[PDB]
Coordinates of C-alpha atoms and ligand atoms in Angstrom, one line a residue:
Chain A
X1 CA 0.0 0.0 0.0
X2 CA 3.0 2.3 0.7
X3 CA 4.3 4.2 -2.3
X4 CA 7.9 3.1 -3.2
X5 CA 10.6 5.6 -3.9
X6 CA 13.9 4.6 -5.5
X7 CA 16.3 7.1 -4.0
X8 CA 18.9 7.7 -6.8
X9 CA 22.1 9.4 -5.7
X10 CA 25.9 9.4 -6.0
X11 CA 26.3 9.7 -2.2
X12 CA 27.1 6.1 -1.7
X13 CA 30.4 6.6 -3.5
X14 CA 31.9 8.7 -0.7
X15 CA 32.2 7.4 2.8
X16 CA 31.3 10.8 4.4
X17 CA 28.4 11.6 2.2
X18 CA 26.9 8.1 2.5
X19 CA 27.1 8.5 6.3
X20 CA 26.0 12.1 6.7
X21 CA 24.0 13.1 3.7
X22 CA 21.8 10.2 2.9
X23 CA 20.1 9.4 6.3
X24 CA 18.4 12.9 6.6
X25 CA 17.0 12.4 3.1
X26 CA 15.8 8.9 3.8
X27 CA 14.3 10.1 7.0
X28 CA 12.4 12.9 5.3
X29 CA 10.9 10.6 2.8
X30 CA 9.9 8.0 5.3
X31 CA 8.3 10.7 7.4
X32 CA 5.9 11.1 4.4
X33 CA 4.9 7.3 4.7
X34 CA 7.0 6.4 1.6
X35 CA 8.9 3.2 1.4
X36 CA 12.4 4.1 0.5
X37 CA 14.6 1.9 -1.8
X38 CA 18.1 3.1 -1.4
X39 CA 20.3 1.2 -3.8
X40 CA 23.6 1.3 -2.0
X41 CA 21.9 -0.3 1.1
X42 CA 19.8 -2.7 -1.1
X43 CA 22.7 -4.3 -3.0
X44 CA 24.7 -5.4 -0.1
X45 CA 23.4 -9.0 -0.5
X46 CA 25.5 -9.5 -3.7
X47 CA 28.6 -11.7 -3.7
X48 CA 31.3 -9.0 -4.5
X49 CA 33.9 -11.8 -4.6
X50 CA 32.5 -13.1 -7.8
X51 CA 33.4 -11.5 -11.0
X52 CA 29.9 -11.0 -12.3
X53 CA 28.9 -8.8 -9.3
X54 CA 28.7 -5.7 -11.6
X55 CA 26.2 -7.3 -13.9
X56 CA 24.0 -8.4 -10.9
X57 CA 24.1 -4.9 -9.4
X58 CA 23.1 -3.4 -12.8
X59 CA 20.0 -5.8 -13.1
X60 CA 19.0 -5.4 -9.5
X61 CA 18.9 -1.6 -10.0
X62 CA 17.1 -1.9 -13.4
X63 CA 14.5 -4.1 -11.6
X64 CA 14.1 -1.8 -8.7
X65 CA 13.4 1.1 -11.1
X66 CA 10.9 -1.1 -12.9
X67 CA 9.1 -1.9 -9.6
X68 CA 9.2 1.4 -7.8
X69 CA 6.4 4.0 -8.0
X70 CA 8.7 7.0 -8.4
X71 CA 12.3 8.1 -8.5
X72 CA 13.8 10.7 -6.1
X73 CA 17.0 11.6 -8.0
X74 CA 19.8 13.7 -6.3
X75 CA 21.0 15.6 -9.3
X76 CA 23.7 17.7 -7.5
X77 CA 27.0 18.2 -9.2
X78 CA 28.2 19.5 -12.5
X79 CA 27.3 17.4 -14.2
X80 CA 24.8 15.1 -12.3
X81 CA 25.9 11.5 -11.8
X82 CA 25.7 9.4 -14.9
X83 CA 24.2 6.4 -13.1
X84 CA 21.5 8.5 -11.6
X85 CA 20.9 10.0 -15.1
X86 CA 20.5 6.5 -16.6
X87 CA 18.1 5.5 -13.7
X88 CA 16.2 8.8 -14.2
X89 CA 15.8 8.1 -18.0
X90 CA 14.5 4.6 -17.2
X91 CA 12.0 6.1 -14.8
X92 CA 10.8 8.6 -17.4
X93 CA 10.3 5.9 -20.1
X94 CA 8.5 3.8 -17.6
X95 CA 6.0 6.6 -16.7
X96 CA 7.2 6.6 -13.0
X97 CA 6.6 9.6 -10.8
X98 CA 9.7 11.8 -11.1
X99 CA 11.1 13.9 -8.3
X100 CA 14.3 15.9 -8.5
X101 CA 16.7 17.1 -5.7
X102 CA 19.4 19.7 -6.1
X103 CA 20.7 21.9 -3.3
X104 CA 23.7 22.9 -5.4
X105 CA 23.6 26.6 -6.1
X106 CA 25.7 26.4 -9.3
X107 CA 23.8 27.2 -12.6
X108 CA 24.7 24.7 -15.3
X109 CA 22.0 24.3 -18.0
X110 CA 21.5 24.3 -21.7
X111 CA 18.2 26.5 -21.7
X112 CA 16.5 29.3 -19.7
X113 CA 13.4 27.6 -18.4
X114 CA 15.0 24.7 -16.5
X115 CA 18.0 24.9 -14.1
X116 CA 19.6 21.8 -15.6
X117 CA 19.9 20.0 -19.0
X118 CA 16.3 20.0 -20.3
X119 CA 16.3 16.2 -20.8
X120 CA 16.2 15.7 -17.1
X121 CA 12.7 17.2 -17.2
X122 CA 11.3 15.3 -20.1
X123 CA 9.1 13.2 -17.8
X124 CA 7.7 16.2 -15.8
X125 CA 4.5 18.0 -16.8
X126 CA 5.0 21.1 -19.0
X127 CA 3.1 23.2 -16.3
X128 CA 4.2 22.9 -12.6
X129 CA 7.4 21.0 -13.2
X130 CA 9.0 23.0 -10.4
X131 CA 6.6 21.5 -7.9
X132 CA 8.7 18.3 -8.4
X133 CA 11.9 20.1 -8.0
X134 CA 13.3 20.3 -4.5
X135 CA 16.2 22.5 -3.5
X136 CA 16.7 21.7 0.2
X137 CA 16.3 18.7 2.5
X138 CA 13.8 20.7 4.7
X139 CA 11.5 21.2 1.6
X140 CA 11.0 17.5 1.1
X141 CA 8.1 17.5 3.5
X142 CA 6.4 20.7 2.1
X143 CA 2.7 20.2 1.7
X144 CA 2.8 22.5 -1.4
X145 CA 5.2 20.2 -3.4
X146 CA 4.6 17.1 -5.4
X147 CA 5.6 14.3 -3.1
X148 CA 2.9 15.4 -0.6
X149 CA 0.3 15.8 -3.3
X150 CA 1.2 12.3 -4.7
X151 CA 0.6 10.9 -1.3
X152 CA -2.6 12.7 -0.5
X153 CA -4.2 12.0 -4.0
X154 CA -4.2 15.8 -5.0
Chain B
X1 CA 53.3 30.1 14.8
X2 CA 50.4 28.0 13.6
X3 CA 50.7 26.5 10.2
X4 CA 48.1 27.7 7.8
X5 CA 45.9 25.3 5.6
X6 CA 43.9 26.4 2.7
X7 CA 40.9 24.0 2.7
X8 CA 39.9 23.8 -1.0
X9 CA 36.7 21.9 -1.6
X10 CA 33.4 22.0 -3.6
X11 CA 31.3 21.4 -0.5
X12 CA 30.2 25.0 -0.2
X13 CA 28.1 24.8 -3.3
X14 CA 25.6 22.5 -1.7
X15 CA 23.5 23.5 1.4
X16 CA 23.6 20.0 2.9
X17 CA 27.4 19.4 2.0
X18 CA 28.3 22.9 3.4
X19 CA 26.5 22.3 6.6
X20 CA 27.3 18.6 7.2
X21 CA 30.5 17.6 5.5
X22 CA 32.8 20.7 6.0
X23 CA 32.7 21.2 9.8
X24 CA 34.1 17.8 10.7
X25 CA 37.0 18.2 8.3
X26 CA 37.7 21.7 9.6
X27 CA 37.7 20.5 13.2
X28 CA 39.9 17.5 12.3
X29 CA 42.5 19.9 10.9
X30 CA 42.1 22.3 13.8
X31 CA 42.5 19.4 16.2
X32 CA 46.0 19.2 14.9
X33 CA 46.6 22.8 15.8
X34 CA 46.3 24.1 12.2
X35 CA 44.9 27.5 11.2
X36 CA 42.3 26.5 8.7
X37 CA 41.3 29.0 5.9
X38 CA 38.0 27.7 4.6
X39 CA 37.3 30.0 1.7
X40 CA 33.5 29.6 1.5
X41 CA 33.1 31.1 4.9
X42 CA 36.3 33.3 4.8
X43 CA 35.5 34.9 1.6
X44 CA 31.7 35.0 2.2
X45 CA 30.8 33.0 -1.0
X46 CA 27.4 31.7 0.3
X47 CA 25.2 32.0 -2.8
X48 CA 25.5 32.9 -6.5
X49 CA 27.8 36.0 -6.9
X50 CA 26.9 39.3 -8.5
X51 CA 28.3 41.6 -11.2
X52 CA 30.7 43.6 -8.9
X53 CA 31.8 40.9 -6.6
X54 CA 33.1 37.7 -8.3
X55 CA 36.4 39.3 -9.3
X56 CA 37.1 40.2 -5.7
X57 CA 36.3 36.6 -4.6
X58 CA 38.7 35.2 -7.1
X59 CA 41.4 37.6 -6.0
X60 CA 40.9 36.9 -2.4
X61 CA 41.3 33.1 -2.9
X62 CA 44.4 33.7 -5.1
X63 CA 45.9 35.8 -2.3
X64 CA 44.9 33.1 0.3
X65 CA 46.7 30.4 -1.6
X66 CA 49.7 32.6 -1.9
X67 CA 49.7 33.3 1.8
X68 CA 48.9 29.9 3.1
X69 CA 51.5 27.3 4.1
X70 CA 49.7 24.3 2.6
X71 CA 46.6 23.3 0.7
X72 CA 44.2 20.6 1.8
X73 CA 42.3 19.9 -1.4
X74 CA 39.1 17.8 -1.3
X75 CA 39.3 16.0 -4.7
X76 CA 36.2 14.0 -4.5
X77 CA 33.9 13.7 -7.5
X78 CA 34.3 12.7 -11.1
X79 CA 36.1 14.9 -12.0
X80 CA 37.4 17.1 -9.1
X81 CA 36.1 20.5 -8.8
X82 CA 37.5 22.9 -11.4
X83 CA 38.0 25.7 -8.8
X84 CA 39.7 23.4 -6.4
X85 CA 42.0 22.3 -9.3
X86 CA 42.9 25.9 -10.1
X87 CA 43.7 26.6 -6.5
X88 CA 45.7 23.2 -6.3
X89 CA 47.7 24.3 -9.5
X90 CA 48.4 27.6 -7.8
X91 CA 49.8 25.9 -4.7
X92 CA 51.9 23.4 -6.8
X93 CA 53.6 26.2 -8.7
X94 CA 54.1 28.3 -5.5
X95 CA 55.8 25.2 -3.9
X96 CA 53.2 25.0 -1.1
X97 CA 52.7 21.9 1.0
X98 CA 50.1 19.7 -0.7
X99 CA 47.6 17.4 1.0
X100 CA 44.8 15.6 -1.0
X101 CA 41.5 14.1 0.4
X102 CA 39.3 11.6 -1.5
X103 CA 37.0 9.2 0.2
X104 CA 35.3 8.5 -3.1
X105 CA 36.0 4.9 -3.9
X106 CA 35.6 5.4 -7.7
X107 CA 38.7 5.0 -10.0
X108 CA 39.0 7.8 -12.5
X109 CA 42.5 8.4 -13.8
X110 CA 44.7 8.6 -16.9
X111 CA 47.5 6.5 -15.4
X112 CA 48.2 3.5 -13.3
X113 CA 50.1 5.0 -10.4
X114 CA 47.6 7.7 -9.2
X115 CA 43.9 7.3 -8.7
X116 CA 43.3 10.6 -10.4
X117 CA 44.7 12.7 -13.3
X118 CA 48.5 12.6 -12.9
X119 CA 48.7 16.5 -12.8
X120 CA 47.2 16.6 -9.4
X121 CA 50.3 15.0 -8.0
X122 CA 52.8 17.3 -9.6
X123 CA 53.6 18.9 -6.3
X124 CA 54.0 15.5 -4.4
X125 CA 57.1 13.3 -4.3
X126 CA 57.6 10.5 -6.7
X127 CA 57.9 7.9 -4.1
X128 CA 55.7 8.1 -1.0
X129 CA 53.0 10.5 -2.2
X130 CA 50.4 8.2 -0.6
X131 CA 51.4 9.6 2.9
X132 CA 49.8 12.9 1.7
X133 CA 46.7 11.2 0.3
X134 CA 43.8 10.9 2.8
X135 CA 40.9 8.5 2.1
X136 CA 38.8 9.1 5.2
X137 CA 38.0 11.9 7.6
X138 CA 39.2 9.4 10.4
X139 CA 42.6 9.4 8.7
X140 CA 43.3 13.1 9.0
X141 CA 44.6 12.8 12.7
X142 CA 46.8 9.9 11.9
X143 CA 50.4 10.2 13.2
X144 CA 51.7 8.0 10.3
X145 CA 50.4 10.5 7.7
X146 CA 52.0 13.5 6.2
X147 CA 49.9 16.2 7.9
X148 CA 50.9 15.4 11.5
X149 CA 54.6 14.8 10.5
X150 CA 54.6 18.2 8.7
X151 CA 53.5 20.0 11.9
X152 CA 55.8 18.2 14.2
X153 CA 58.8 18.1 12.0
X154 CA 58.3 14.3 11.6
Ligands
IMH201 O1 28.7 -0.1 -7.1 C1 27.4 0.2 -7.0 N1 26.7 -0.2 -5.9 C2 25.3 0.1 -5.9 N2 24.7 0.8 -6.6 C3 25.4 1.3 -7.7 C4 25.0 2.2 -8.8 C5 23.6 2.8 -9.0 N3 23.7 4.0 -9.9 C6 23.4 5.2 -9.1 C7 24.6 6.2 -9.1 O2 25.5 5.8 -10.1 C8 23.1 4.8 -7.6 O3 21.9 5.5 -7.1 C9 22.8 3.3 -7.8 O4 21.4 3.0 -8.1 C10 26.1 2.5 -9.5 N4 27.2 1.8 -9.0 C11 26.7 1.1 -7.8

């Protein structure tokens, strides 16, 4: 019954960011009643001693995106992380709900409407796309933004 | 008397990174007795910079690298931050002490010795550069690593 969010981020690659940045974002999402699939935590059942572990991780994440209800993509950085971008593209083509997170104040875009490369927004509505665009962790729980509307049927 | 470290990083660009990742690194360096120059706070670079102010910021950082004793460069990301790289090149050419920090486990290099672009190591010794290369915040206080040895004369 709980909506499922795939929490796509590059924060698992750095010891500090995985330890400090991810838990507050997971907590905010769970506070909304969302079930959070965080792929760095989810893929620790893989045998990383066997040579094929990379393929198995790839397919597990592909399946998690097919089975989630929405993606919450941390698109910090210049540019955003390539694996997050692949996962985001998967979610767009599978008609998943799309939520984007960027608290990076640098401006790196190819157009004047959106704050990043326009293809990151291809799965969002023409009107109101910014309602799915989160620029601070405290904003995740805002009743005026899309995550909350999604959860309240509005 | 206190040695001066320029803490170069991209962590001031993100609100969560600025608030959560930087203070533990600053206090680890200060715990060794280092005067830490953290440019985002020092040069008040807290948002996007205006039409009369960005040249002064660049000059302040250039003078800070000229006046420091060493640089502590956070070279996480793929690739490392371009401004951190500019500041690092300044410190290399000015024969400053060089310390590098990367807790990102991803390999992204053009060579087999170094985990990053070989130019980042041009101010480090040929043999034993790993003593200046920190891969965890826990490691900063290590008496077997180059920062401590630098302060105590080995
Ligand atoms: O080594 C890995 N372990 C777990 N997940 C990933 C990923 C996936 N891609 C995303 C970032 O590259 C991340 O959110 C995760 O879903 C790439 N590499 C790894």
